[PDB]
Amino acid sequence: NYGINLPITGSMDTAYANSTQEETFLTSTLCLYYPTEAATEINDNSWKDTLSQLFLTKGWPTGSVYFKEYTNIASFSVDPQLYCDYNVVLMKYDATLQLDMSELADLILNEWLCNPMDITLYYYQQTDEANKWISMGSSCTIKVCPLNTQTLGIGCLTTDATTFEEVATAEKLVITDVVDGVNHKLDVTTATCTIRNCKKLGPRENVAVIQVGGSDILDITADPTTAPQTERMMRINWKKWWQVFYTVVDYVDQIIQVMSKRSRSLNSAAFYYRV
Amino acid sequence: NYGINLPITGSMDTAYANSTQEETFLTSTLCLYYPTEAATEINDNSWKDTLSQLFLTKGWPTGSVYFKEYTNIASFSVDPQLYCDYNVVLMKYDATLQLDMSELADLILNEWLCNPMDITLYYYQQTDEANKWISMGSSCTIKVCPLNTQTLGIGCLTTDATTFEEVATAEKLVITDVVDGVNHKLDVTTATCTIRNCKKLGPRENVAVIQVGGSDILDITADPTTAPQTERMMRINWKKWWQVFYTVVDYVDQIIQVMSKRSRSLNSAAFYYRV
Amino acid sequence: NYGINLPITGSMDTAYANSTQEETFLTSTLCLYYPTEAATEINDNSWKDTLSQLFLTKGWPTGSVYFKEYTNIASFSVDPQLYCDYNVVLMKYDATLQLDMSELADLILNEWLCNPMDITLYYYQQTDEANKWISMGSSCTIKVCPLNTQTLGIGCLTTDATTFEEVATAEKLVITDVVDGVNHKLDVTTATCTIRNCKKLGPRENVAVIQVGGSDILDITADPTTAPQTERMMRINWKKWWQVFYTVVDYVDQIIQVMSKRS
Amino acid sequence: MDVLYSLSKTLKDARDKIVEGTLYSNVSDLIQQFNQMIITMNGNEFQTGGIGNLPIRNWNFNFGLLGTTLLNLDANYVETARNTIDYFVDFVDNVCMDEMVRESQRNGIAPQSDSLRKLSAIKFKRINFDNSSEYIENWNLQNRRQRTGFTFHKPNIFPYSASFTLNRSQPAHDNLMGTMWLNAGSEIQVAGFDYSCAINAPANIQQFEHIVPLRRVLTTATITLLPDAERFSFPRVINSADGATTWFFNPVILRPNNVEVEFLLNGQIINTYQARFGTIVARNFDTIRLSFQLMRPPNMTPAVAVLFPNAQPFEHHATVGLTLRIESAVCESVLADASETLLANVTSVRQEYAIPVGPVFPPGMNWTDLITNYSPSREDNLQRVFTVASIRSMLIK
Amino acid sequence: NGQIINTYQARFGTIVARNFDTIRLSFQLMRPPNMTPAVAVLFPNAQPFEHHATVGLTLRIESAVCESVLADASETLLANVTSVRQEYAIPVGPVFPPGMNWTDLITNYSPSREDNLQRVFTVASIRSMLIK
Amino acid sequence: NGQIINTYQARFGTIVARNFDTIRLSFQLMRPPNMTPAVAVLFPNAQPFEHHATVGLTLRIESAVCESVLADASETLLANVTSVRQEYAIPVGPVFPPGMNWTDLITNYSPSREDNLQRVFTVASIRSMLIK
Ligand SMILES: CC(=O)N[C@@H]1[C@@H](O)[C@H](O)[C@@H](CO)O[C@H]1O
Ligand SMILES: CC(=O)N[C@@H]1[C@@H](O)[C@H](O)[C@@H](CO)O[C@H]1O
Ligand SMILES: [Ca+2]
Ligand SMILES: [Ca+2]
Ligand SMILES: [Ca+2]
Ligand SMILES: [Ca+2]
Ligand SMILES: [Ca+2]
Ligand SMILES: [Ca+2]
């Protein structure tokens, strides 16, 4: 600190520094995320060996490339843990799980500000567009009643949990956005779920997303107006998995050009916890 | 200018600001860690209610101070997750758990930055004095097999696992120092254990350790020529555990005077491995 | 003397006076303290004779060295009356009495201004950080309850003495630190104990402690932050008690040096 | 202005040369000057004072000439001349105090008082005598645009400044790097520190630098350079940059490695000195650039090696410093120094008569505030007032 | 004479003093209210104080104008007087200190010593024109 | 000298400036409170900003009166000085920049360079009467 608020004065017409691509590849590390159905068709014992010899062509040393698995998009969102320095995640397109792909890319491609929440005691409201309610666990069902100026429910009853209305039903990861001004009374199955409010900071620059198949289904914002398309939401086609891994190993240089590290956190969690 | 490292220039004639040690008591939070045999000796349920009145005299509000507990040093060290602003956990001395107490304070009082490890694919080495191997889990049994420049073992066969050197068996936390600069081969039982390499950045500021009884043993630096005693290491002698609790409530200004906020928690450390 | 008023100027480049250590020997006393079993292994009858011949070599006169004893740390600490010019004690290290050796050296090495306490009639608070409660006797069992503003108990009942919160059970010497500002109702065993309202001052310089045994266990402060080791909290290692006394007789000029007189 | 010096020169010589018993040929040319003062000054009338608590006095000259007929001067001739000198020397005091107290912003080099404007007519030019003092010679050379020069002993060229700079910091304040300095009078003491003692620096060498710009160009200076800052050598506690918290600095001191001192003029290196201590010269410069570096010692005895570990707790902090001092130099504008008392005569007149703050000079004639913003409008006023203060010092000490 | 001629409050560097015969310095120590953990270990609440606080000033007269004669750093009139008395082995008289000690002479600087000291510095100034 | 001689507030076109040596421009950006649908797409609330806001000014001195010599756009006195030095291959001396660089000469425009520059522009003005 103390050099935060001070200005920096550069200039035009100075000589460029040389390349950084080789020294980026030496010290740093890289680790991709692939589903279980990838290695099933591949069914090799040492295909992790075969790939790591091919990353060695593109400047990465031996002990810098690690591989991790997950069952599906639902099982991947129990705890989103980002281990290494540069992350890529590989998502097969499902025509049904269309929100759940968009819920995953919202949490991973952005930074969050998570405070704890106690729903059986208090009343909670949202502050602005940046305040969201993010719940994750085994299975939980969020039921919310709007409330009024004198703490009387609008279209519900504060003592009845049947007159509450639901916004989720048995989902691994839920991001709930409600109306701004009013308070709300919550009903979450707390035995299998942990709901917290979190604030969206600027985006995270450790991670990119590759859709394996399909078309783009990506409102990672909450408003319906912006459905932005940054350069880390990529998409390819497929009929064999070997072509997918050969595309990643060949074009590391185009991907790493967009990744832009040193947004790495000190932990491996997807958020920041306060209290 | 979040990631730029600009200098600061300050005078030597600026007047001091005000006292500030009574605003920090309003905003910040405090967490206490005690072994579960404390509440056995206390014989009360309202002692959490009781002490929260006694912190209110020194300036803390009613909702700031949080109480957490553990069973022993072995089971607390499985995954110490320390969340509040100012953390103060007092452990009990044991003559036989002499290394296991100092391995706990190596994690807590400093700050480690960790990269994952894959034992099956890769061979590992430590680069400098900061690289240690931190493994924690239900039961960790680590075996080492050092290698020469030809990938052949020195005193170990790379096919037989009984000839391997052994550094630990069945612990909850092991910090391993090997010879810096030699490729090794590992035999961690990763069914109940999880190893990853880590390098030490600096001290973790917001946490203190109060040893309860026993002589002065503590060795942060796994280095024979250096055993420093910092200001956030404290020892008291006990006969009863009420008198321990009245001591820490009385001297809350001196506990907090010698520990600052976490430098990674601030918005200043934006792209310097935040939190 | 000592004076917080009445400044004293003095000067520099004045000549150093002669070594007055010899005149200090001729006009002073010295009193050693030992646990009772130290006289048992020696099992001489005239061992107080054979030591006073050896203090005479170092300049102490033939009427100035006195030998006194005690049973243990538990029994010496009921009323330590130290009144010679110079005093040193010999404490044998016990591992389980680690908390009692710190409480004695707190009482021995520092000055205390004490005031009485009436448990039956009054309610007591602690004002200063340097305000502590010292209780001595045969069996002290101290029970403490805090207080709100409205003269009502916090975690106890001011009538029921069972619901109190005790800090000591049957100990010869107890030094009690309680949070400052809150009033308290007390309940002690007044038949075999005497609790008092003492206040810490600077250290006593006519006493010194030689720990005889294991490691340094001395937090003679009250906060957990500081645990200093001063000029005269010292320690040796032993195998024979008869060898321990030779070291004390030989090196008098260093033990007397780190301590001052009564004045 | 030229005739105000010429009044004071021949009143100083009149009290020195007209003594009792002296031969007449010793004073035969002074009396022709002193009689020709009186003829010019008779019939005129003047008025001084009026600003602040300086009282208003009226002056009127009606005197007679001196005799030119003795062989040795007697006590009649001395005592009839002392009661004429004592009226003129009281007149010159009140004109010099009337001019040191006034100032202007448009053209400060012109006379400001009412009496000195009246003495600048061609009627009064015949009183002009020799101009041999240092300040009246530089008043005339600079009035024709010729090159001047004032010689100083320890000139007050640096304004007071005591501060620091942290090139590496964190809120714990336990691993720091940067410089500290004191610039005061004619002396620079800079000291660079590094808590880690270059354990992770490339080739275990940490580079420091400190650049001091001047306000005016100095010429032919004599400079003493010594390889220790004795002021930044003891343990102290220092506040933070914004006065929030305090931080601790416990130094141990190595020797400065690879010292280079440069003397710049419009960005051009005039002189340079590399590891050369003692007395040095500097012929023409307006910017001093100090450069020095810390090097970790490669071989250490066991008493030294305990001080500098590899880990984080650093209890003994490394420190490297220098010390520079200007003994004497030649400038072209007026300054203050340690030998002459021309600044002390100006402020003592303004403080005595309770003079209000004008448009040019700082309140209270603060020299730190005056050399900081040393504009060309302040330079013309400061030369005009130091020159009048030099004229008054001949008659009245 | 007990009257405040000049005063300066937290103003360092070069200052002036138009007329004075007594200098009165005043300064105070204030404990810093905020301290980092490296500073807070130095100053405990209890009795063992191993690091002692210190506050100081430094004053220096560069040039002044007096009315009686004195000694200074530029001219050598005191050195010419003592060198004559030391060379010719002159006994101690009734006025000046033995050996012309300046510390003993400015301590008791009586009006009888002032008239002698001016009479001898003036003769030493006349001799310096001819014989250096 | 830190004193405001002239000031102008939201006044464009031609302005005057009677005496100055420092120009201080001040202007601010304000987000428009009402926006048509073609404008509101440009400025979202979230992070991807593809259209960046910009506010600028432009100042230009037409004619002024200085007291030292300078260069300008009408007369060719600087061009006559450099053309003589370039033609006869003159070595770099102690005062002027190498090649008579005007950017390097007005950056450090010392009083020693001002007296030389007036002495040479005046000689170049005498030569321009006879030989163009
Ligand atoms: C100690 C002092 O005089 N300083 C004042 C203090 O009295 C006041 O209570 C405080 C309120 O924030 O502001 C400080 O500047
Ligand atoms: C025995 C001893 O140390 N010698 C000192 C001697 O140096 C001193 O000059 C004398 C007078 O004070 O007193 C003696 O005791
Ligand atoms: Ca409803
Ligand atoms: Ca909302
Ligand atoms: Ca083997
Ligand atoms: Ca190692
Ligand atoms: Ca109770
Ligand atoms: Ca207390």
Author numbering:
A (entry chain c), B (entry chain n): 52 to 326
C (entry chain m): 52 to 314
D (entry chain N): 1 to 397
E (entry chain M), F (entry chain C): 266 to 397
Original authors' sentences:
The external layer is formed by trimers of the VP7 glycoprotein in phase with the underlaying VP6 shell and 60 trimeric VP4 spikes, which project from the VP7 layer, that clamps them and partially covers their base. This outer layer is responsible for the first steps of RV infection: attachment to cell surface receptors, lipid bilayer penetration, and release of the double-layered particle (DLP) into the cytosol, where transcription of the viral genome is initiated.
To obtain high-resolution maps of activated and inactivated particles, TLP from cells infected with rotavirus in the presence of trypsin (TR-TLP), or in its absence in medium supplemented with the protease inhibitor leupeptin (NTR-TLP), were purified by density gradient ultracentrifugation and characterized by SDS-PAGE. In contrast, for the TR-TLP, the proteolytic products VP8* (28 kDa) and VP5* (55 kDa) were detected as two distinct bands. Three-dimensional reconstructions (3DR) of NTR- and TR-TLP were computed using SPA with imposition of icosahedral symmetry, achieving resolutions of 3.40 Å and 3.48 Å for NTR- and TR-TLP, respectively. The resulting maps provided sufficient quality to support full atomic modelling in the foot and stalk domains, while in the body and head regions, a combination of backbone tracing and rigid-body fitting was applied (representative examples of model-to-map fitting for each region are shown in S8 Fig). These enhanced densities, together with the icosahedral 3DR of the complete NTR and TR TLPs, were used to build and refine the full asymmetric subunits, including all VP2, VP4, VP6, and VP7 chains.
